Amino acid sequence: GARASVLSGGELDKWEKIRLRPGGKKQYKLKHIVWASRELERFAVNPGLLETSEGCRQILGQLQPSLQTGSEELRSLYNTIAVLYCVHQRIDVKDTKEALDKIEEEQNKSKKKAQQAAADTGNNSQVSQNY
Numbered sequence: 001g002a003r004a005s006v007l008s009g010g011e012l013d014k015w016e017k018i019r020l021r022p023g024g025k026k027q028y029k030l031k032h033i034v035w036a037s038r039e040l041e042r043f044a045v046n047p048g049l050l051e052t053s054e055g056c057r058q059i060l061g062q063l064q065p066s067l068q069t070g071s072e073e074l075r076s077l078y079n080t081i082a083v084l085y086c087v088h089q090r091i092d093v094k095d096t097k098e099a100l101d102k103i104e105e106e107q108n109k110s111k112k113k114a115q116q117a118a119a120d121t122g123n124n125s126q127v128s129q130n131y
């Protein structure tokens with residue numbers, strides 16, 4: 001590492017604007033970018049990924065399925081990494097939840113075109129009614 005750079009001038013302005021929660025009274029700050037950095041390296045994940053539109057995405061992939069059995073720490077992570085990610089994907093949000101909706105909407109479409117072979121294990125079919 002020579003010159004670290006997570007959020008540029010533009011990303012900074014928007015970052016400070018974005019909130020951690022939809023129904024809160026606090027916005028985002030460097031405190032969250034640095035904090036998540038320390039917790040990241042702890043999970044064998046370098047903080048340099050936070051400044052990468054690609055890394056931020058992967059980090060959410062491992063936390064996604066972890067959210068089911070994750071603690072307060074995992075929450076703040078998936079929440080922060082979610083906002084920072086959208087920032088690198090030319091995405092604009094107002095809160096953390098908002099970003100999640102976008103990341104989930106973009107994935108929901110890339111769910112059927114991801115397997116096309118391993119999506120026939122269970123059993124589920126559409127509904128049929130009259131009129």
Ligand SMILES: CCCCCCCC(=O)OC[C@H](COP(=O)(O)OC[C@H](N)C(=O)O)OC(=O)CCCCCCC
Binds near residue numbers: 040043059069077
């Ligand atoms: C099967 C039993 C389930 C019961 C719940 C048990 C839940 C649990 O133990 O959680 C920790 C879990 C395990 O780590 P592991 O490789 O096994 O090594 C264990 C070793 N003791 C240690 O100190 O690490 O790690 C993650 O958070 C994954 C990070 C995900 C990446 C996301 C970070 C951004």
